[PDB]
Amino acid sequence: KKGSEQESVKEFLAKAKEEFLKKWESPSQNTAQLDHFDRIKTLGTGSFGRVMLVKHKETGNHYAMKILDKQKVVKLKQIEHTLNEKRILQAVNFPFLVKLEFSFKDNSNLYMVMEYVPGGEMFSHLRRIGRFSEPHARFYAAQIVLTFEYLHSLDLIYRDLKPENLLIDQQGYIQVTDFGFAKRVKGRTWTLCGTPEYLAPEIILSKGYNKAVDWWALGVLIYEMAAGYPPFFADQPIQIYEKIVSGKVRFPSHFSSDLKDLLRNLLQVDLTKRFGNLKNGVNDIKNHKWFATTDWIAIYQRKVEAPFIPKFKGPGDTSNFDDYEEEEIRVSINEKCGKEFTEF
Amino acid sequence: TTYADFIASGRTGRRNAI
Ligand SMILES: Nc1ncnc2[nH]cnc12
Numbered sequence: 001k002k003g004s005e006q007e008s009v010k011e012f013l014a015k016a017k018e019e020f021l022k023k024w025e026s027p028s029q030n031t032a033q034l035d036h037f038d039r040i041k042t043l044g045t046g047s048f049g050r051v052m053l054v055k056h057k058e059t060g061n062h063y064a065m066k067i068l069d070k071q072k073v074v075k076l077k078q079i080e081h082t083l084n085e086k087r088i089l090q091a092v093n094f095p096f097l098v099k100l101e102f103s104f105k106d107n108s109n110l111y112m113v114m115e116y117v118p119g120g121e122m123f124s125h126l127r128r129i130g131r132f133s134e135p136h137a138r139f140y141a142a143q144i145v146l147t148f149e150y151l152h153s154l155d156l157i158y159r160d161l162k163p164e165n166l167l168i169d170q171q172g173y174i175q176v177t178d179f180g181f182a183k184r185v186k187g188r189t190w191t192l193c194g195t196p197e198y199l200a201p202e203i204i205l206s207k208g209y210n211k212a213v214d215w216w217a218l219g220v221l222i223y224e225m226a227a228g229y230p231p232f233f234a235d236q237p238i239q240i241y242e243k244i245v246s247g248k249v250r251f252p253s254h255f256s257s258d259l260k261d262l263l264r265n266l267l268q269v270d271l272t273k274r275f276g277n278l279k280n281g282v283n284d285i286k287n288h289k290w291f292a293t294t295d296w297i298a299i300y301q302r303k304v305e306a307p308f309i310p311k312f313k314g315p316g317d318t319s320n321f322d323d324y325e326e327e328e329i330r331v332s333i334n335e336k337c338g339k340e341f342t343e344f
Numbered sequence: 345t346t347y348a349d350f351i352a353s354g355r356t357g358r359r360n361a362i
Binding site for chain 2: 046047123127130160162164180181192193194195196197199227228229233234235237250252
């Protein structure tokens, strides 16, 4: 059904695309420098560097600064992906996408300075409590549905959905971080990337694929939130891939009938049948019986009561994050990889 | 139980991208 509510969504996305393309075509660059910030503590790590809590000297604001070593990016063949990441993040604008405040580079590193989201990773809370109730999981899932509706309308694919990347803010709502695999593409793409538990079968099998891989990954996320473990797990990645492509999924006995039905349609190997990829697009998902209680506009406006509010001891506190070994930020006296990253 | 199998597995910590 295409009624008044659907036309409002359409008009909202049209204006959102006008604003995105202006920034996509004319990206911001070199908007701060390293000594504008005091470095406080590491919030997480990855293959190219680390995300650090920092304090902006001139305002006293706290931020999260992602640091990438240019030489390590080159060795991992992630140059173009890193240029994608920053060009996309500086252009997007949505309530559940973390905001990029500054970016710059020096002889050794690339820096993206984002809003600090103090509540910690969904991953931490999910592992500690075991599993979320279905209303809890539905609250978070609705935010991801709207965020993918926004991203996909801009021809963006996200490609790394997982609880490790979903931060909980002070109102209890989600902020998506890490756009290292995000890509703007019309038609199909072919890169083998993501996280093993969340890969769609068409990625594993080296087919061309499109935004339907994000909807598969949503199915994995909802399952993991409500069960406490992912639908395909093993000790070695090859064993995970064999389960993903097999065509078989089993559900905990406490999953509601509606939840199992939604997940059978999201975790669908047949692309002609996977929810999110049919003629009705995202509306097959938004109108599924499992989402009957979800007021999509109220979610977008952050007027729904959150399942929990993270503990907050004060500004700059990190109690909702694990501790990591601290390593220096070394800046070489010689410029590294300048031509490769000239547009950053 | 499937939960007990997950908790004893090697992939309950943060998962790196490929
Ligand atoms: N990992 C992270 N932790 C907290 N705030 C963030 N903002 C962006 N990435 C973040």
